[PDB]
Amino acid sequence: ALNTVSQLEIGAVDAQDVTASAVRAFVGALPSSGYHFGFVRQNVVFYLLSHATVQTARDPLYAAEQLHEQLDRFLRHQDRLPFYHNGATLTAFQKLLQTLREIQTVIAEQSGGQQPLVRRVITQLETAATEARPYVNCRAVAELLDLTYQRLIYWACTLMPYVLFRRDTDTELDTVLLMHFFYTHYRSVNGDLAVEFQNYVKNSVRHMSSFVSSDIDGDQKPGAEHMRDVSYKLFVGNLQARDASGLMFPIISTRISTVNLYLSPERMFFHPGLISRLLSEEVSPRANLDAYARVCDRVLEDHLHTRLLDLTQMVMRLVELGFNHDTCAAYAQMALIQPASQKSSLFVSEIREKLIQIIYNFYTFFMCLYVYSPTFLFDHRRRLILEQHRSTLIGSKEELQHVWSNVTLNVNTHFAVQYTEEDFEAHTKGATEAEREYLYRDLHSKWGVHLFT
Amino acid sequence: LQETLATEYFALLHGIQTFSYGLDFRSQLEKIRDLRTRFAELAKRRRLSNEGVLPNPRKPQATTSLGAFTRGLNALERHVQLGHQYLLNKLNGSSLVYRLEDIPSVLPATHETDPALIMRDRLRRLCFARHHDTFLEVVDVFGMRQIVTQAGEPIHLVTDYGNVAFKYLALRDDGRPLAWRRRCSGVVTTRYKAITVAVAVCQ
Amino acid sequence: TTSLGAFTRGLNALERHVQLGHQYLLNKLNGSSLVYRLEDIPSVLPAT
Amino acid sequence: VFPQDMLQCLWLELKPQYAETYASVSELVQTLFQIFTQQCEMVTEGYTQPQLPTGEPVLQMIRVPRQDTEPGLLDVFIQTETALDYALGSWLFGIPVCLGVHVADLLKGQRILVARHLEYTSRDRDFLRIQRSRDLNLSQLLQDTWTETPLEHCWLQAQIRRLRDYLRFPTRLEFIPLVIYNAQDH
Amino acid sequence: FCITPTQWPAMQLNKLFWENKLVQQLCQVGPQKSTPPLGKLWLYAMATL
């Protein structure tokens, strides 16, 4: 029986399959006296929910409500610890189900100023999660919170407004690039962006010809390959257009002399050509690259100088700079693709190392955010995530061992899953010497670490 | 304990399938060796076998014997070792590239799997230069439809076009030959006509 | 009065029939890019 | 790499006799691919053993017969040297070349008539224009040909980087090549 | 009207009508290798029927 129940701890069970009669048979057939049988006589509902899974059904609310109703029947069928009791377990799980209904209600309402509404509704969701926070041990609530956080963060990263982009120092190219990135990363509901683009292109007709090449020589320039699409659907006057015809247009001049006079150094990440030429180390020595050098230094210093509201705040701060996960990954690829040995100035090498740090850090941060949840499963998958990252991004390069500290430091800073020894003491204040060992064993199996003794 | 390690095995299988480990062959070898030692320790705590059907990643089964797990481990070792050997041979045979470290590792950020493409590239790769004459079809450890010879070397690893443009122009054979030429929607030099006339007259 | 060798020959005939049909289908999918998978291929009913 | 109009002009201006049966160099390329695929023959057969000694469940076994004369089209293209070959090689690799037609032999072979057909050097504008018109973009092939082959993907990226680096910086030979070719059959 | 031959390029519209790959594969079935592709007759049959 002990081996079976330990394997049950290691494994997971289906909410629909388990019934009240099944729980009654499991309790009755289980031996009466034991150092774990007392707990299952005391907290069978919480213990069963500790390992249950609902993620398979793909509909958390209804399956979890069915599980709650079966547990309610078993609790009708049914003083050691006021903090954790089967009736208290049912009450807390019903509260969590209310939270899981209201998160979907919020998503439906907000998705159809929008920013204050988003902030207040996400604050309500955070309060709801805090109400559901203490029983993080359970696998059922673990996957429920995991899916909830996945959905909310995926919705929030896309529902970004466009107010923060406009600056007085922004040029015509900078503005069109900002709204271009907005189109390529956010088009779900913001449909007026194309109309504004069509209105604005007629304003900057004279200014649009200043930052372009001749026809014949522009295509061979480095970095035009990646920016051909943005250029084509800049020139055509409609962001919905597709460059399937392979036409040749006035290619944008990516030279630093043109960029500095026609762009702003702070909004560079929206422009792919400068990234490509900087990684490729094909920059002319005479080029004056102090602009992005200082911008890179100050941005990294501000980011390294650093709650769910705070997480979201950093989220729209970082992506406001144009850092999109797909874009960051695709424009970190050539960092590995580009050769290590080439001729470039020391400042260029230093800013390249800085940008390698930045691309790795933001790529890891974004992908962890895509799988973020204040639960043990996040760290459990993050172990394999960091192993894979060591395998691929760092590789066998010796110089890449220095840049490792910032990635792990930032990801553990922003996505820390907090657990308190006082929390476990309260969870086991009434638990006797007999019952604490298997709660400890289940926690060790789930988290994977020897957190306390 | 056994279930958690089996899930770790399946996660490693998916990572190798999705190329989450890149060109770090040593890391994959160390991980699979550690997994094999862990499964051997599980067997000792609970005899290893070299027979049994492979575990199904799509449908995990608790009836799989430890021999199946050991077989899957050795299959992964063979896959990674044959891959590394093929990289070593191609590096020796091609002088264009300098070192394996300079060769990057691509990310699955650009993922697109059409079954039609997945079958057509393999069927066109069949009659290319491969070490063994005959051929066969199996289901790989990853669970997909992998095609290998009797040696078990992957066709996508034992047969190659030798050029990116060759593969691109070979798999582009769909309907009409050229599409962008049609999309663009678009007579001799007079000197050549003059030289043709003069050469004909002289001859 | 049919012999066991006759039944062995019939088993071989059925095996070759099914293998021959399967290999002809494989060749037809190989030569024609019109169809991508056997799953999309319909099955007719023998009602007619 | 080259634009299709310039390719059409070169094809029409120096039509190879054995290639005159077709209308483009591209058509030659797809017909060569077709004959290469026709050389390959696939036959599927059953196997008594359902699994390998390793144990992978084997479904079917496939053999590749290459059984069978007039010279092959791909062959006759291979051993026949044409002005097309050297012109395309010079334009692709960024090297000049001098192509001329042999009229006849005079003074018992002491003097040979080589009519001025065309010349390639860094001086004439057409050579510079065609050299700078080369579009060294090949990452679009990688995007258009993703077949769940990341190892080959990295190999192809490295190969493209090396070939583009070589093409941008060709080796110079003091601009003195010369080719003699016939006019009746190129 | 009138047309300038030099300005107007010449395509191969057969590659879209009967020289395309799929119709050629469909009409390749014939008694002997000497038979030319039958897509020319195949389009006739489809149009008639």
Side-chain angles (χ1 to χ4, degrees), chain A residues 424-439:
Chain A
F424 180 75
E425 279 294 326
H427 185 24
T428 63
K429 165 165 195 95
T432 76
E433 296 86 5
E435 307 303 334
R436 37 167 179 80
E437 44 190 349
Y438 285 160
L439 276 75

Side-chain angles (χ1 to χ4, degrees), chain B residues 19 86-87 90 125 155-162 164 167, chain D residues 142 146-147 149-158:
Chain B
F19 203 65
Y86 172 49
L87 276 296
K90 76 175 78 173
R125 277 167 97 92
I155 286 296
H156 75 271
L157 293 188
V158 76
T159 72
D160 203 2
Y161 289 61
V164 57
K167 181 182 196 294
Chain D
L142 280 69
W146 174 237
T147 52
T149 54
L151 214 63
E152 315 293 328
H153 187 193
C154 304
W155 198 9
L156 290 186
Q157 191 38 258

Side-chain angles (χ1 to χ4, degrees), chain E residues 20-45:
Chain E
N20 57 3
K21 184 68 174 293
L22 205 67
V23 175
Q24 276 182 353
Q25 302 324 110
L26 287 184
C27 69
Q28 265 162 343
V29 188
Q32 59 203 28
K33 290 288 192 58
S34 80
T35 51
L38 295 174
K40 193 59 166 211
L41 179 59
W42 178 242
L43 61 90
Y44 268 72

